[PDB]
Amino acid sequence: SMAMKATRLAIPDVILFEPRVFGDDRGFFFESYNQRAFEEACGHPVSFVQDNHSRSARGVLRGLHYQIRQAQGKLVRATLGEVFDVAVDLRRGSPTFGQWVGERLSAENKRQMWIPAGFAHGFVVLSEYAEFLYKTTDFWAPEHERCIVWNDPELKIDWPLQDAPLLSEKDRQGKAFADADCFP
Template identity: 45%
Template sequence: MKAVAVPSIAGAYLFQPTPHRDDRGFFSRTFDADVAKSVGIDPAAFAQDSVSRSHRGVLRGMHLRSGAGEAKLVRCSFGEVFDVVVDLRPGSPTFRNREIFRLSGETQESVYIPAGCAHGFQALSEVADVSYRIDRAHDPDEDVAIAHDDPELAIPWPLPPALVSARDSAAGSLAEALETRR
């Protein structure tokens, strides 16, 4: 496994495992504490693991947390997703930059998303499971959502949204989210 810096988002990394394939399928390491440490990520800082299942076209996001934010390690463990990260840290050298990843169960790649970045994804396969390793317990009072179709973000979602939650449908603009975070 290796960690590759994501130049467009300061502090973000793409973790690329080496799945071992044979006639049975594959075996893959999905997290390695030593590799995380080698890029300055404290593996002991993660406090919660979660998983979501989505069907083709389902769009989740854009989400972030107010206050201290939350760092997370995101992986598509089954299926395929179009994954988006936006740097919303005002002091960051990559503030407002966006990066897009195609994460899949075939590659088992993970994206480390620093606290203060917004995240969202759209399921490309019939079923997609996304696993999250998060550095703080969830506090719903800190949830911030940004409209997935905000023109300032200009995210080129590959499919028309098949389903968006009521919360995400009611999400405000990027400008409102930035004001909320102050």
């Protein structure tokens, strides 16, 4: 059936991958991506054109981001530390439109999320520092990126936080879900 776990989440097009590890803490190997397993998992062909690597401190929240033109699927993981990663379904006519799912991803649990075109995406850093990396199917373009505010009362995402997040001005100024332009 495979040789890295794939799990459909409450929103079925959002998928959680868990690679099999070979070795232990002193010395290990794992596949962080296999085209065959991945394409068999999500049901269609995918091409990744860009990889993006970032480092953010504790409590930094980046989201909820999405591009309507140059739409992107994103396969996300943590190589250092721990994030809580969130996908919001924004697809015209989706039976789960306006719903969110969230998973803790870390360098320890080695978990990943596939967030297809049509979703908004965000994460908050829970560890002292987190290094986050993702593969996209089209290029990150700021002039096309849109944003829904992290703490929108209608989505009412359950961020595992005890303190206020540290947001950029842009994310602070995120649109309310109500007011958001969504995907055709």
